Amino acid sequence: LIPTVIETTNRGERAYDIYSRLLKDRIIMLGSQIDDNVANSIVSQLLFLQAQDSEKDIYLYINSPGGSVTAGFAIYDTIQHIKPDVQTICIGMAASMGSFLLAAGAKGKRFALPNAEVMIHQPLGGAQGQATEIEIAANHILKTREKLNRILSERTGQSIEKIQKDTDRDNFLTAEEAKEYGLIDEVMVPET
Amino acid sequence: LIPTVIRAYDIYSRLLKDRIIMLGSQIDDNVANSIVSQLLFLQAQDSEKDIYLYINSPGGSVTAGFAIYDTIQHIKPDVQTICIGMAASMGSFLLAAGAKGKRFALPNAEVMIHQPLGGAQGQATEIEIAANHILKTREKLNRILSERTGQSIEKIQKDTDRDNFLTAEEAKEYGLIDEVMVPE
Amino acid sequence: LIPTVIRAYDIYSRLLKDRIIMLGSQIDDNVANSIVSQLLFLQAQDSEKDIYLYINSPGGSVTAGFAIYDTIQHIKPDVQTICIGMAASMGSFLLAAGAKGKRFALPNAEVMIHQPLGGAQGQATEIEIAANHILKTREKLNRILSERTGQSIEKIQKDTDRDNFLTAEEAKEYGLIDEVMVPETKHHH
Amino acid sequence: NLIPTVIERAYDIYSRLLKDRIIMLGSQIDDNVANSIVSQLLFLQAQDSEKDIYLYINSPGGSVTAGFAIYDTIQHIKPDVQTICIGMAASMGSFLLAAGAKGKRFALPNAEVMIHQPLGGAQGQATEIEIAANHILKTREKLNRILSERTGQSIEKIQKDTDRDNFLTAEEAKEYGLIDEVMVPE
Amino acid sequence: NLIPTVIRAYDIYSRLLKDRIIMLGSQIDDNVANSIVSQLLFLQAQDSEKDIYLYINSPGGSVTAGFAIYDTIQHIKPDVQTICIGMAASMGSFLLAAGAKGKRFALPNAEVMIHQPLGGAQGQATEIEIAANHILKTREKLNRILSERTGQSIEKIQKDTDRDNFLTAEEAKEYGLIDEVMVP
Amino acid sequence: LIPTVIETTAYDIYSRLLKDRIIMLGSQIDDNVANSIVSQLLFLQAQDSEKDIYLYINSPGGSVTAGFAIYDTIQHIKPDVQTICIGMAASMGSFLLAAGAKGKRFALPNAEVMIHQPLGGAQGQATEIEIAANHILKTREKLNRILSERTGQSIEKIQKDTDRDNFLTAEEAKEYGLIDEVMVPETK
Amino acid sequence: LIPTVIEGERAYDIYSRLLKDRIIMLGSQIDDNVANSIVSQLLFLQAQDSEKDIYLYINSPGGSVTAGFAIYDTIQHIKPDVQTICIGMAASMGSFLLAAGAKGKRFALPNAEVMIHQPLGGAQGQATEIEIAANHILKTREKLNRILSERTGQSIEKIQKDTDRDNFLTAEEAKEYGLIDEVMVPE
Amino acid sequence: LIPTVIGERAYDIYSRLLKDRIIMLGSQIDDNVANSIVSQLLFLQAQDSEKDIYLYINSPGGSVTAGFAIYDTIQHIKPDVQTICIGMAASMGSFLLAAGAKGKRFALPNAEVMIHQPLGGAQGQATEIEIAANHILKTREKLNRILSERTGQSIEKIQKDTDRDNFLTAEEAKEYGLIDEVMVPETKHHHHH
Numbered sequence A: 001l002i003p004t005v006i007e008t009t010n011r012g013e014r015a016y017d018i019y020s021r022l023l024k025d026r027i028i029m030l031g032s033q034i035d036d037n038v039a040n041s042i043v044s045q046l047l048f049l050q051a052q053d054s055e056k057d058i059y060l061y062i063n064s065p066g067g068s069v070t071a072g073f074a075i076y077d078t079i080q081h082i083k084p085d086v087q088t089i090c091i092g093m094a095a096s097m098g099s100f101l102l103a104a105g106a107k108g109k110r111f112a113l114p115n116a117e118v119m120i121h122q123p124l125g126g127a128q129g130q131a132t133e134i135e136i137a138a139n140h141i142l143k144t145r146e147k148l149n150r151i152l153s154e155r156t157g158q159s160i161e162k163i164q165k166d167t168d169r170d171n172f173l174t175a176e177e178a179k180e181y182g183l184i185d186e187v188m189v190p191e192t
Numbered sequence B: 001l002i003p004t005v006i007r008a009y010d011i012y013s014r015l016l017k018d019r020i021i022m023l024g025s026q027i028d029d030n031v032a033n034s035i036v037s038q039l040l041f042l043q044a045q046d047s048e049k050d051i052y053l054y055i056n057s058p059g060g061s062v063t064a065g066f067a068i069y070d071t072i073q074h075i076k077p078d079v080q081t082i083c084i085g086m087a088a089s090m091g092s093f094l095l096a097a098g099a100k101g102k103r104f105a106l107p108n109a110e111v112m113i114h115q116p117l118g119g120a121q122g123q124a125t126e127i128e129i130a131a132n133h134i135l136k137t138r139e140k141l142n143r144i145l146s147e148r149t150g151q152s153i154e155k156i157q158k159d160t161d162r163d164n165f166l167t168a169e170e171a172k173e174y175g176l177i178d179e180v181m182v183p184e
Numbered sequence C: 001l002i003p004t005v006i007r008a009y010d011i012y013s014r015l016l017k018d019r020i021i022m023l024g025s026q027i028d029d030n031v032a033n034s035i036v037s038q039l040l041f042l043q044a045q046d047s048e049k050d051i052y053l054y055i056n057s058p059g060g061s062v063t064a065g066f067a068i069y070d071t072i073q074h075i076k077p078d079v080q081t082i083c084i085g086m087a088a089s090m091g092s093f094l095l096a097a098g099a100k101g102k103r104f105a106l107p108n109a110e111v112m113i114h115q116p117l118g119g120a121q122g123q124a125t126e127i128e129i130a131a132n133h134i135l136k137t138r139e140k141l142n143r144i145l146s147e148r149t150g151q152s153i154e155k156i157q158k159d160t161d162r163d164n165f166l167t168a169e170e171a172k173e174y175g176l177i178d179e180v181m182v183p184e185t186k187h188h189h
Numbered sequence D: 001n002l003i004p005t006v007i008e009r010a011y012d013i014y015s016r017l018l019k020d021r022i023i024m025l026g027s028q029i030d031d032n033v034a035n036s037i038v039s040q041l042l043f044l045q046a047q048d049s050e051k052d053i054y055l056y057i058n059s060p061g062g063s064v065t066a067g068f069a070i071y072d073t074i075q076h077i078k079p080d081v082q083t084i085c086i087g088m089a090a091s092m093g094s095f096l097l098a099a100g101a102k103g104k105r106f107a108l109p110n111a112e113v114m115i116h117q118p119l120g121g122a123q124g125q126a127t128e129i130e131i132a133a134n135h136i137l138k139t140r141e142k143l144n145r146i147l148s149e150r151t152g153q154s155i156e157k158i159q160k161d162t163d164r165d166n167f168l169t170a171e172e173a174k175e176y177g178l179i180d181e182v183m184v185p186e
Numbered sequence E: 001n002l003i004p005t006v007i008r009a010y011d012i013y014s015r016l017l018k019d020r021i022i023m024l025g026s027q028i029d030d031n032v033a034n035s036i037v038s039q040l041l042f043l044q045a046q047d048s049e050k051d052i053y054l055y056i057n058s059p060g061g062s063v064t065a066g067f068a069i070y071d072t073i074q075h076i077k078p079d080v081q082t083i084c085i086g087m088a089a090s091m092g093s094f095l096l097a098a099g100a101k102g103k104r105f106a107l108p109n110a111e112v113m114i115h116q117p118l119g120g121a122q123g124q125a126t127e128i129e130i131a132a133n134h135i136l137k138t139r140e141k142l143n144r145i146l147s148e149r150t151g152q153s154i155e156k157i158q159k160d161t162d163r164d165n166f167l168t169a170e171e172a173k174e175y176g177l178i179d180e181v182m183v184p
Numbered sequence F: 001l002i003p004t005v006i007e008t009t010a011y012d013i014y015s016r017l018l019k020d021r022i023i024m025l026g027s028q029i030d031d032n033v034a035n036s037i038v039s040q041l042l043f044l045q046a047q048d049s050e051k052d053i054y055l056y057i058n059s060p061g062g063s064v065t066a067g068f069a070i071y072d073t074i075q076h077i078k079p080d081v082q083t084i085c086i087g088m089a090a091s092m093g094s095f096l097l098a099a100g101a102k103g104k105r106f107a108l109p110n111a112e113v114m115i116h117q118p119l120g121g122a123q124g125q126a127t128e129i130e131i132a133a134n135h136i137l138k139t140r141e142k143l144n145r146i147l148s149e150r151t152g153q154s155i156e157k158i159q160k161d162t163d164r165d166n167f168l169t170a171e172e173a174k175e176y177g178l179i180d181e182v183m184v185p186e187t188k
Numbered sequence G: 001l002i003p004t005v006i007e008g009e010r011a012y013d014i015y016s017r018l019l020k021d022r023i024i025m026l027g028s029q030i031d032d033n034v035a036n037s038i039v040s041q042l043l044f045l046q047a048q049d050s051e052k053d054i055y056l057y058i059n060s061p062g063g064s065v066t067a068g069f070a071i072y073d074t075i076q077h078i079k080p081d082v083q084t085i086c087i088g089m090a091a092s093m094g095s096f097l098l099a100a101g102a103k104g105k106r107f108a109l110p111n112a113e114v115m116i117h118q119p120l121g122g123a124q125g126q127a128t129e130i131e132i133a134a135n136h137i138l139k140t141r142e143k144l145n146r147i148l149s150e151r152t153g154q155s156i157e158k159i160q161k162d163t164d165r166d167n168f169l170t171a172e173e174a175k176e177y178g179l180i181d182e183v184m185v186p187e
Numbered sequence H: 001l002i003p004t005v006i007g008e009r010a011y012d013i014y015s016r017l018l019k020d021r022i023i024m025l026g027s028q029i030d031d032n033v034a035n036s037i038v039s040q041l042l043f044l045q046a047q048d049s050e051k052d053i054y055l056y057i058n059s060p061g062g063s064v065t066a067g068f069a070i071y072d073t074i075q076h077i078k079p080d081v082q083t084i085c086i087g088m089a090a091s092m093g094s095f096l097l098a099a100g101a102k103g104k105r106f107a108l109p110n111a112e113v114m115i116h117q118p119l120g121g122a123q124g125q126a127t128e129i130e131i132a133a134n135h136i137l138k139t140r141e142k143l144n145r146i147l148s149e150r151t152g153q154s155i156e157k158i159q160k161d162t163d164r165d166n167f168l169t170a171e172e173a174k175e176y177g178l179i180d181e182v183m184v185p186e187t188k189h190h191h192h193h
């Protein structure tokens, strides 16, 4: 399914699957629903790239509907921990934890292509069982939402109260609207 | 298949003629609708004679249980309650709701109390509403259980945090029933 | 199994003899068809005497609820509404539609209000038609609830955006009912 | 859901209403529903060919041929068949609402009326698909014209207005010509 | 759902049977055929001279069950009128055409459809052969009788039923499947 | 299933075509397919930012956002991206066919092109239905605007012509402005 | 499992080995995946040598009409003659592609089975949606029948009549019909 | 898992056997199996058009058209194709067993051979059933004719003998003309002398 690229060297042929070829140039793909497997791979790629060169930028491609919040925070905290700037670029769509991570790229280096779609909303979950178990689960997801909104406020310049209102239901943004919101810095226009 | 006794009655309708109502299954809206309609009918037949509510039930819907609860307290006749077999959760709540002095259990009947159960899926704000609602429902149940048993609200809360099984004698000491009915 | 009382009647048919109608389930077309026919029958028997609508319902179909609603408003007799157990969504809409001054709930009954639910699949234009339809239905429900409760249309809108649970006393203060029904006068001897 | 019994003799509630020439179309229209309704119409005509019949309609529609069983029986018999929409009348249901005796087609104020084109399907060879398409197109033309005749609207307007689901209030259905009066409370 | 009762108390269909009307209002299987032919035999016994009325709103079904109805109609003495209301397809339209000559009707918007029989066969080549010969022979029998009852040639019936062929009531009359379209 | 070819100076056949700057869009469009194609585009631009790229399209369409991932990457990079429809291009597939470099959008004579409006759904509260409805309508406005720009047809004509499934022959797709040329076979 | 052959040393699965000698396998139901592979193989072989013949093996029950036309149009586009040989069966779009080989170079082995019929499809929904689907599949059938007429020498009316229902032909009958040029007899 | 054997080349066991011109027909015959076998036959002919090929047959049969893909490719190519039944050869599998080079069709002593008529189906209108019935009947006539030529039995005898499942020992399949020889084991003295 995934194509292979083969390039000529002085000692023969060099074969990569396409994504590993991009990782050679410090490009990481967040191109699926965020689960623990996806997050583990991404944070390992980040750790490896920092070790290769702690000064060159890293590029995080984001085409993702979101997914697990804790998995998203694995990626978020690793981005903040390492030294290199991590650029983010939304191509296609970034929704929920996907758009949260978009907004977490290095300031000035968060991008979207002109027709990319950005969506923000509140976290989702569930709870079954006794009243006290329901209470624990509710308190947890409310605290998780407050943590998300606080960081989003710091990253966008929007107040926490406005974030709360704007994420109560699904909120779709064009690339330009996401820039005006403070989720990205620039809509990347086509090269000449 | 329910036997007939001879006017010809199925056995349960025959018992209803002598003012006996069966709460003998899981409590859902159908069961509750039937029981509260029987209560209203019996009140109309005679506003002074006692009514006898048989309880062999694992509980079920809290709102359906409160339909039965509110109709019992509304009507003029005393409603006796007798636990035979088991009364668990909303069933034991209704056992405690019978006319005071007239709440009974047979010696080997099982009584169980616990907190209400529910669920919620969706957005954080939806989970919050569902949580606030079932917590308020539990506070409502505990307050009434406190009034009917004489136990404090704090003791009810602690004693219902997990499944709490009581013998008939223990249900009497707790105040859920008034007497263990001896042979026969 | 529904008990019989002795002519022999099942218990619900016995209550219908005293002008009591049961709304005790999820509201679908079958349930609404039965209730509106009972209403038509009772009006024909006596166009002056009150009718009693028992409500223990989580709601259900909006159009089916409006079948009941329009039949209640059409006929001459007052239709009392009595919430026992629960009245949610279309169920609480119908609780609020009873004859004014004759809408009741028992002390521990639960009243819940919220916006209608629905769905849509297909082409953008088909989704648009379905969306405009359910929005218009919500406006229709909110307008009538506003008239019946005395609350403004915008307050109803805010208060039904999500599930809103009310105690019987809170439903009275809201205007969904007129009275929390107290226990009957009985002797202490 | 048990149907209550009334005393007058003892009837289930729907049989009691049928004693007063009231017929219930309160479900999806299939052949079973249609056969029952047309038999009730035939029975009521035989009891009295002059006195009105009352057709209650709370239906999402259904089978077109089953709908035409009801339509053709209404038109055949002598008594006027009043129609009243209570709750909803959609698709074939609203077609039958519009088929009641002229001047005696009603809706209650909050009833919902919906009109749209017929639905169907076809699987198989190209020639089989062609046959099914020609058939359902012919059925749509048949429906649109009767609707044009019953409403006073041009066929082309019916065609455009039924291309997609078209929801109407009771008042809009009156102005469209599908009903004669919105029955208001007194 | 429920079939209404009319008042002696009759369900509506039994009331219609009282006036010699038989309902063919569903897909034709053996159960439907057994009921209809029993009604036919009973009605003949009640009166061998008065007409019988067969209502037809059917998509067809089993060919042998259809021929049970066909043969019983031809056997008895009373004329059996047929009236298509709603739809008559395949074996349904075959039985419509089998009504007493001059007494086959359709209401103006009734739908009539004719086509060839449908079936299947699985297994060994020789088993497939037996089933193929059987359904071809069955088609020959239907076409021969349809020719006699419509006045159309066998070759035309064969061509006209090769694929689903929908007819209006007026077209069904011109074809010879019915005698008149019943006007209001 | 997929054959291997080996040159001596081993590829699956599609990787061999990628060596000559040919990308396959040969399936329903989901995020995985889009991620692969946009990465191939980025890689080919880096190999040579002047040589044309060739996008083969045999697709019934699929995800609109995934299609726009491909659309935006095509417009972003320097090389012209030719598009050729072989077999079928429907819905987002025909949108991407129309997005190829002006003058370099092709179809073979019997290829099938279909345009229609986007599909979706919504279930839940009235307010949720409204949000989903407003979103897919805005998505349709976005698709129609770009299709207008790429074809020369008015937005109003695109709207009318995509209300229901609209099948076009390759030649009709050329007259519509979705492609520039039908590539006709050589004489013998 | 597909066996490997070894010819330094180089290993091929048997189908990749045959492709090395300009042989392409159409041995399954025709869907987009099968069509994408075959047209890519055709493009590759043309690039290897634009003059030398290509051999298309056909053992297929047919499948998607658009996928088949992807293969049809690529065959006609490239310079090399594409021989077709039916081995086992060629039905529906399979027999259409069989008839589409370079003229003089369409073959079947003596017991190969050839079947022609009209295209199959479906439609669900509103009357207007059914009409669109019907008009589409009728136009597709006309297009197929037109090309089959040109490739076989039969009139369009005869193709329409002969494909109304499933029509089975022996290899010899396919030759007389004009679907193939020769029955390849054993040596 | 299929074991590997080891210039220094590594082969899975079946590919190693193919190097010595041995082809495995060891499963139900569908189009995939047939496509693989005919490609192996074509490859082996191109390697050497004179040397024998060995077709191992342990198969319950399957698709008739897929079987005829194998049959016609065997008859087309120049090398003799030996057939050896090991385990079982049923229906189309036994048809291919009888199709081996004359004098070179074998079975081991406890191998099972079964012949029967082809199986199929038909659904739909009477005329569609007629078309499917006529087709499978002609296919059976085609099979019976070739089996008659290959075995020496008359077409009418084959018809009768395949009307139902017909199980044959290796010796009975030889007497029938489906194979030429039962390959008997050599004794210990036979193996050393």
Ligand SMILES: CC[C@H](C)[C@H]1C(=O)N(Cc2cc3ccccc3c3ccccc23)C[C@@H]2N(C(=O)NCCCC(F)(F)F)CCC(=O)N12
Residues within 6 Å of the ligand: A043, A044, A047, A048, A049, A051, A078, A081
């Ligand atoms: C002082 C640097 C680290 C704070 C510290 C340490 O805490 N951790 C844990 C760790 C593990 C981990 C695992 C997966 C993903 C993210 C992480 C991660 C992310 C953020 C912070 C910590 C982690 C491993 C890391 N080491 C590392 O980076 N070695 C260089 C070679 C790296 C290469 F190339 F192998 F990738 C091993 C040596 C080491 O001291 N540390």
Ligand SMILES: CC[C@H](C)[C@H]1C(=O)N(Cc2cc3ccccc3c3ccccc23)C[C@@H]2N(C(=O)NCCCC(F)(F)F)CCC(=O)N12
Residues within 6 Å of the ligand: B036, B037, B040, B041, B042, B044, B071, B074, C014, C015, C016, C018, C020, C052, C053, C054, C082, C084
């Ligand atoms: C004064 C009695 C009631 C306060 C009052 C009234 O509010 N309601 C509503 C109601 C309906 C209902 C429905 C089902 C279940 C419970 C209930 C219920 C339970 C508690 C309180 C009220 C209800 C009906 C009842 N009536 C009744 O009892 N009639 C006499 C014959 C009754 C018989 F025999 F038919 F059962 C009808 C006349 C009437 O004034 N009322």
Ligand SMILES: CC[C@H](C)[C@H]1C(=O)N(Cc2cc3ccccc3c3ccccc23)C[C@@H]2N(C(=O)NCCCC(F)(F)F)CCC(=O)N12
Residues within 6 Å of the ligand: C036, C037, C040, C041, C042, C044, C045, C071, C074, D016, D017, D018, D020, D022, D054, D056, D084, D086
């Ligand atoms: C005041 C006259 C009515 C406006 C008018 C008329 O429009 N309708 C239709 C109808 C049918 C219907 C059907 C089911 C449910 C609701 C309804 C309904 C509800 C509201 C308004 C109308 C309906 C039947 C009713 N008739 C009726 O009431 N007969 C007396 C015996 C009644 C008894 F006992 F049988 F129930 C039949 C005679 C009659 O003139 N009308």
Ligand SMILES: CC[C@H](C)[C@H]1C(=O)N(Cc2cc3ccccc3c3ccccc23)C[C@@H]2N(C(=O)NCCCC(F)(F)F)CCC(=O)N12
Residues within 6 Å of the ligand: D038, D039, D042, D043, D044, D046, D073, D076, E015, E016, E017, E019, E021, E053, E054, E055, E083, E085
């Ligand atoms: C108006 C008279 C009819 C032109 C004629 C005739 O054609 N038919 C067939 C028929 C059958 C049928 C069957 C089901 C539904 C609809 C129908 C139907 C509807 C419309 C037209 C015809 C039908 C039966 C009817 N008869 C009838 O009405 N008898 C009186 C007592 C009837 C009672 F009480 F039993 F209902 C039997 C005697 C009779 O002459 N005719």
Ligand SMILES: CC[C@H](C)[C@H]1C(=O)N(Cc2cc3ccccc3c3ccccc23)C[C@@H]2N(C(=O)NCCCC(F)(F)F)CCC(=O)N12
Residues within 6 Å of the ligand: E037, E038, E041, E042, E043, E045, E072, E075
């Ligand atoms: C005309 C006389 C019959 C040739 C003969 C005879 O062969 N049969 C078998 C039979 C059974 C049957 C069963 C189901 C459906 C069709 C049939 C049927 C149809 C056609 C021909 C025969 C049948 C029963 C019938 N009898 C009958 O009709 N008695 C009068 C009371 C009738 C009543 F009211 F009960 F219906 C019993 C007496 C009797 O001699 N015969």
Ligand SMILES: CC[C@H](C)[C@H]1C(=O)N(Cc2cc3ccccc3c3ccccc23)C[C@@H]2N(C(=O)NCCCC(F)(F)F)CCC(=O)N12
Residues within 6 Å of the ligand: A021, A022, A023, A025, A027, A059, A061, A089, A091, F038, F039, F042, F043, F044, F046, F073, F076
């Ligand atoms: C100034 C050039 C780019 C604007 C910028 C940058 O924004 N991005 C993000 C990106 C990532 C991405 C990921 C997947 C698909 C599409 C994209 C994509 C598509 C359009 C625009 C941006 C992207 C990566 C790219 N880099 C790149 O192309 N390096 C050369 C080698 C590339 C090779 F060979 F590895 F493919 C890494 C170095 C770099 O500065 N940039």
Ligand SMILES: CC[C@H](C)[C@H]1C(=O)N(Cc2cc3ccccc3c3ccccc23)C[C@@H]2N(C(=O)NCCCC(F)(F)F)CCC(=O)N12
Residues within 6 Å of the ligand: F016, F017, F018, F020, F022, F054, F055, F056, F084, F086, G039, G040, G043, G044, G045, G047, G048, G074, G077
């Ligand atoms: C004669 C020139 C072509 C008309 C033109 C061009 O339009 N296309 C698109 C295309 C893509 C495609 C993709 C898959 C299947 C069929 C096709 C296809 C089939 C028919 C016609 C076109 C295509 C690619 C092709 N190129 C090619 O053949 N390069 C040589 C190396 C080829 C090798 F070895 F890699 F296969 C790339 C260079 C080029 O100009 N063209």
Ligand SMILES: CC[C@H](C)[C@H]1C(=O)N(Cc2cc3ccccc3c3ccccc23)C[C@@H]2N(C(=O)NCCCC(F)(F)F)CCC(=O)N12
Residues within 6 Å of the ligand: G017, G018, G019, G021, G023, G055, G056, G057, G085, G087, H038, H039, H042, H043, H044, H046, H047, H073, H076
């Ligand atoms: C004996 C010569 C052939 C009549 C003729 C020709 O018609 N065909 C089609 C064909 C394709 C095919 C495909 C799969 C299975 C069976 C077949 C098959 C079986 C029987 C007859 C034909 C085929 C390919 C074959 N060629 C071949 O054998 N090349 C040498 C290298 C072969 C190797 F090693 F690659 F296998 C290509 C050169 C060639 O002229 N022909």
Ligand SMILES: [Mg+2]
Residues within 6 Å of the ligand: A079, A080, A081, A082, A083, A084, A085, A086, A106
């Ligand atoms: Mg960083």
Ligand SMILES: [Mg+2]
Residues within 6 Å of the ligand: B072, B073, B074, B075, B076, B077, B078, B079, B099
């Ligand atoms: Mg009391």
Ligand SMILES: [Mg+2]
Residues within 6 Å of the ligand: C072, C073, C074, C075, C076, C077, C078, C079, C099
């Ligand atoms: Mg009223």
Ligand SMILES: [Mg+2]
Residues within 6 Å of the ligand: D074, D075, D076, D077, D078, D079, D080, D081, D101
């Ligand atoms: Mg009339």
Ligand SMILES: [Mg+2]
Residues within 6 Å of the ligand: F074, F075, F076, F077, F078, F079, F080, F081, F101
């Ligand atoms: Mg470009």
Ligand SMILES: [Mg+2]
Residues within 6 Å of the ligand: G075, G076, G077, G078, G079, G080, G081, G082, G102
């Ligand atoms: Mg060519």
